[PDB]
């Protein structure tokens, strides 16, 4: 990855199940009733469903339209709070794609239908904004795999 | 009119015949249980909805509390000695948001306020954080206060 768009900002860590990789991972235990953040390099030997930290990924992989195929568990940076999606929620896509796009660089966060979520800019310097289109909470934020400095908001309706 | 779905306060040495939630691996494991637990954590006893205030000392939890927040698939785990931001909301008349549970980035819309004349001013988020909690002021009526955690 050489767009590094969430650089220097302090934003929430996101979990998806099954994305086997070497980030910190969360064991979801009891059909959905226990959670455990497992230490770095510590072994896991329990039969839960393990969740894996992604950053820079593209969410519509864990996507079957627009419902989610796998569990996602978002960690605030307040250290004290999380949300736990099971596979089957509906989320919402909102593209932010033009000459020039500036988005919100961060996800996990409360919006109201209306709220700007990026400004596009035209060659000659005009702007339009994309807006949330409903309340609800931005869960995740990642660029368009084939269009460089284009994204995408993933919402999940309130 | 209606807000969110009732939030679900458990307190540590509240041992009572309620749902409970052990805390183990210093915050980093939490286990709901139902009806047997001999582990090495604490448990958190629920407690009937009321005023978070009730285990703070100031803006500082006294006790261990955690809060699930079902509408939202959210819980949040106040270790004792965690620090809170008031954010009141006060005036002539005042609307508050009827939810919370939930991030939000600074300047988010709490509260509108609403003068005598029927000018309006808002009550914004001043930092970026964790909308925890939030309560009628117990001697204020209609008046609200939200509690934060800043990240």
Known sequence: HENLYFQGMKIP????????????????????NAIIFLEKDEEYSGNGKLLYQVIYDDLAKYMSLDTLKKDVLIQYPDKHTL???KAGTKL??????????????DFGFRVLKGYRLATLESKKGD?????????????????????RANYVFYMLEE
Do not use: C, Q
């Open 13 to 32: 860590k996101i979990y998806v199940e099954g994305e086997l990789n070497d980030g910190d991972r969360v064991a979801i235990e009891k059909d959905g």
């Open 83 to 85: 949300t736990y999606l």
């Open 92 to 105: 919402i896509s909102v593209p932010a794609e033009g000459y020039k796009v500036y988005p919100i660089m």
């Open 127 to 147: 702007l339009r904004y994309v807006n949330s289109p409903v309340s609800g909470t931005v869960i995740f934020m990642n660029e368009i795999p084939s269009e």
